[model samples]
Target: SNAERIIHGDVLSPILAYMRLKGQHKVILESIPARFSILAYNPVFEIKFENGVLYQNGQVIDRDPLDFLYEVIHKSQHHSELPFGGGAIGFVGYDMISLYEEIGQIPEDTIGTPDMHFFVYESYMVFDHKKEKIHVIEDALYSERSQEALEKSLNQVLEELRIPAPNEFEDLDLSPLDFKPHIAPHKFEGMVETARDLIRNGDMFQCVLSQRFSAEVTGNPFDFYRNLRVTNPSNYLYFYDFGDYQIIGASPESLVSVKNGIVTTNPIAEEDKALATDLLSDEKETAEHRMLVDLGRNDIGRISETTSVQVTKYMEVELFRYVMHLTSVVKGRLLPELTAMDALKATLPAGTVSGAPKIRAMRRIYELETEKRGVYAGAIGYLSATGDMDLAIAIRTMILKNQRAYVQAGAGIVYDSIAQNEYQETINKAKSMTR
Candidate 1:
């Protein structure tokens, strides 16, 4: 706890301003409209994977990738008041499931994605919008140097905030691209029909299929991200810059979270008010939500104490900036032997994104979606060193690499689903990014 320091006041705005000046290679997890956010920079221990090979601090680490992650945290000489509080902040790529289950081959086009990436920071800052306070967590092992560095960084940020807003106006080109879908309309319909057929034949109960859209951009990626934040201020906002590419998103769904031996998951099925009203009454939407709720319960049950699982909330309507959703919460107390990783692995790919009959649905997704998902549909957030975690479903996300931008969205396909309608639903979801 000695490593944790709290400073009160409007630090987030200045920190964000500072980060913008610091350039790329930072992580920001913000609850927009709400003042809560976490910013981490200059990682001391960074682990990344390329083409399935793992590297720690730029050096290849030969071990079970996931096991290696656990080992690193277990042996790390860092301390934080929050469990796994300041440990590893990054993502667990969707394809990582291949190591746990017998999934299909990952397509070759993982352009901007690493199998997994996380950074153990030399220092991190947490902002509580409600309290207007900032918590700076540093590595305890190197307290003297870390504290010295923290103060220097803090002063620079505060001074930067005092200057009048710069008038160096650069008009971002808001020109539009002739957006094209990776899977054409006709083919998308065909795929839906195939999924329906499989459901009817008892191959699976439900399968979620997705589509990717590509367009060329001549504007600032940061500008687009800022627009997204203002447009959808109530969601989980994230930006990860990987030199030549950046992963930016405002996710409306919480895939999973773990804290103090408690595990919770939210299954968010997006809809507008009128549609959500009908969706609640409709058999198809209700069934889709039910399957996900059950899937979440079962997943958590694996590592949860026997009979401790419960549906604390159900069919609750929640609204976001651009869309509305019907969300349900499932909670359970973790078993004594399970770690945060175990709980996360049990619910990989998120039921809402994959489908019912989780494993089978994932296999179906692989068969229909030919290209690798990269960070789309993957969980993005942090796995604290202390064993606590929070991850958002990487929906409403965009990947910018090599001047080409990619956006994707999807709808859950059930037996009663209409292909054209489902396709439009994806279009509606992608509007949050494109507009």
Candidate 2:
């Protein structure tokens, strides 16, 4: 078993068992990479301990994380459903001040860096929904240098910790679940209608409207996560305890992906089941697609050759949780003069959350949305050790504090955007959160 790397395990045993059995030398537990390499799993599991009980948040809902991560390897599979079959999970906090303070109080060694740091503190999740079979590959792992691949190899370094799958090990009813949203009628019917009125009045041609809500829950974060890990595992199941609340979820959209001076972003909008008839004839779908592509093009243009940024693909459909979406890929080459931040600055509040004609829509959103988005409409993912970065738009997200949880959903409001439909879309987006 001198294969240099191996990633395998179930909850009762640490995924690191396989790596250790493979007789590995130094195991890098951190998800952040230096240069380029593939590392094995670092299975560090976090739990919400309250009144002597533990719960895994995401795992309670879906056990799809590990399976989804397997397919994202090497960009071979473009869709999110493939379980390429190996990777690590990350944790972080929503309130920077609180998280920093907690970290400061803890002993330096006891509070280690998380496996993957979540950039977005609000709503999102990542999962793999492989329908056929799992895909397996053998490379140098994330340790060997690939002369042809400019980035580091994939690494599978598991944590020196272990736990039973939440279903098998955690206690569920230690605390009662009675969390309610801070913003009622989160359906946002009134807000969308106002924006619709504006469109009729010619205040602006189009604007993307948004809203936010919150809740409180009492339970072990780990138990909650374990529930999620098993039920709704996606590419992103983040665990961040910003002192007051244990945050968790799985998001599907990639706001941006950057590597070797090449940048690719997928801005999604106008989601619907992609049945040919339902997809091809929808005007709103076409408008949302056009808006995101245009936004992506403009985003790339700031730091790329004008011609380099173009829609590599368009109107592709992908399924997640219980819903389906229409997505498009916009790819471009980075310019010598721009930094990663520059690209981010150009596309921070993602187009899906913000409607097309970005500037005007953003201003309208600021005025329309009752509360500031915080991390809800922002982006989350990873910033590589080499200054490279990738992020996903914060949608289908929930915010938890003091055991209270709040989640939000939104839709792009164009000239043809209907208030009733948009209101339903918000609920549609929030379905998983409620589930």
Candidate 3:
């Protein structure tokens, strides 16, 4: 059986501080102003890939990327009583979409990226910001020696509990680097117009065309992440350090969530709240949101019981730190044969990011964007051993490698989309990473 210990008072601050320690794989998923968050580290089993070869523990698994991931999830054994982040906690990169859909072949040396990366943690801590309590869950497989080491870490965290809370954005010292655009504004507008042509030609109804920006970083990535967490404070806040590289973001969209066989997905179409009336009344925006809702239903319906799918929330306006979004929630009950992995495979590279007629739009995306997306526009969250999950669309994300950071943002292109406005939208989205 798993053990549950409740530690009271501001658990996240100390935990976030503790994560700065070296040699540990850290993941923090927070929804600020901090209603709930999960902090997982110290993985008993970890998996990473190099040049598409899967490495787990100390061995290599020679298999297709998705096949390997499926096998890992299939064989995942856990004894944690908690349902949140109690098993595999990691990310499925955007590039992994190539495996499920017949998008054009991704270049082999496209920045030397992995299909995906994830870790299986035997123990983790969940912070309830409202209740001001920390719930520590330890898996049954944890050995006495492991417990001792874990207790040491726990003691260290407990010691910091008495430390004064630091200012929310204290000592961030973030210096903006000169970021060079991979696609200039005019070129990006051209791509958006091209996407509009495809839509006008009936090739697809919507396509998300994106642009990339690269910069060099002189500050710590963790500190940058801390500042981002405060500034953006999105529902899906993530930071993952993979030794050679790091992926960080605060995304406002939920790709999918599964609990007790019930699945939920959120499709967010953003605009300024000052134009809320216009956003709701605008035909272009409404049509785009509807396409996302329909796409979500279809994707969930693939593995969901027929007649179980429903639009739970339709065209609701939700506000975030940066902007407001018109969002719709779709829910469904899963079929017995389907696992979370199956759900992911059915709906990944989220519809809002990939666009309508997803496969064809993705084909167009592959043709247009200059560089591989890597982890951007992917899904980041956990797949619990108990079959519960919560994943967010990896928008507003930055990938860091060797002091160099890559950020990307995209806008949905429809037949009526204005290329200039769409280009500005991409720039606006990138602000999450920069400012």
Candidate 4:
């Protein structure tokens, strides 16, 4: 029935295809790297959350952020064979926590990022590396409702697709040496001590303290993404352009994913070399990963059917470009009564990002971290209109605004954690952003 909604376009290079949408407002490029990429633009509907206020389609809306999202995606039921058939895609910054719980003092928003921003694109152009073809999919809502009108819409965008892009893929000349940790090494170590003290005091079982690395860069966000895609390719590669601000990342961890009433999360805890198998030998590393696994299970249990939570895999090593992680697969069957938005809200900010005993850990994080996490510790991906979504934890990410770039990474602190080691690893994670 939705077949007429899709039209095959001439094969084009993914990079060139994205460059065509580069200057557009509120554009998103989600790449799978050397395989598949999705370019979503010409948003049909959009929403932003800033200063705890919600705005939809540029008009303020009086409603709970989660509630509004629930209705926005659920309002139009869609099901199809395609991976994505029109949906809301964007980033949910760590500050979105304000909607569910308040973290005392609002830190300085140095990055000037919105708490949550999504564009409801009725059309998606998917690039296939295998076939080198572009598939333009219009959603069931548009063509099914008014086929003739939808044709005109396609004709317009088809014209834009032919809009010639730059002959060359322009790259940023920025050097990694220019980047500096916004938080000094000693300062972050001290924060780790604070987290340890809290852990011993029974205030929190674990808390994640993060540090920021920043530098100024003036360039197209898509160009910045082009630079990273080759160096730091991961399972999820995303670039979001919101006129005044942008976010780019290659994430190796999943915050959560829901498809067909099944929920899953990949909890990444330990990191090392191709010798990451070494993580299996260390008792402390295994214990840390165990904590993440249990916490991940609990997170799924909240919105999952009773007795459905399970750890499908444990402490498996996943190799990334520069480093390797000990990530596990945890999944559950979603409760019939709960929606995908509910599942997202329940596990958001991620246990790996907020730490175990999620609530108190988040409070501890707010107290220890200097500035707001912004898009650093957030999650990014797509939520399809069919109640299916896949989102990754926004780590190894760069937030660019006003000719400046910021990247942040955190270290998990437990009672047995070493402050010096935590400081060094956090620095390493921050540096990986540039790789």
TM-score of each: 0.84, 0.61, 0.83, 0.85
At residue 213, give the lDDT of candidate 3: 80
lDDT of 3 by residue, 212-303 (tens): 78888767787777777777778888888777888888888888898777988888873355678877898877877887888889989988
lDDT of 4 by residue, 310-361 (tens): 8888887766656556878888999888888777787788777887678778
lDDT of candidate 2 over 112-148, digit per residue (tens): 2221232211111222223322232323333343544
| RMSD values, in order shown | 8.7, 14.5, 8.7, 8.8
Please give the CA lDDT of all the candidate structures: 0.76, 0.51, 0.77, 0.78
Candidate 4 clashes between residue pairs 3 or more apart in a chain or in different chains? none
Question: What are the per-residue Cα lDDT tens digits for candidate 1 across 349-370?
Answer: 8877887787898889888887
Cα lDDT over the full model 1: 0.76
The residue pairs in collision within model 1 are 83-386, 84-384, 84-385, 84-386
Stretches of candidate 3 exceeding 4 Å from the true structure? 1-33, 63-85, 107-110, 141-170, 270-274
RMSD of 1: 8.7
User: Relative to the unseen true structure, what is the C-alpha lDDT of residue 304 in candidate 4, on a scale of 0 to 100?
Assistant: 84
Give residue 252's lDDT in candidate 1 (0 to 100). 75
Q: Give lDDT: candidate 2, residue 37.
A: 16
**What range of 10 consecutive residues in model 3 has the weakest lDDT sum?**
5-14
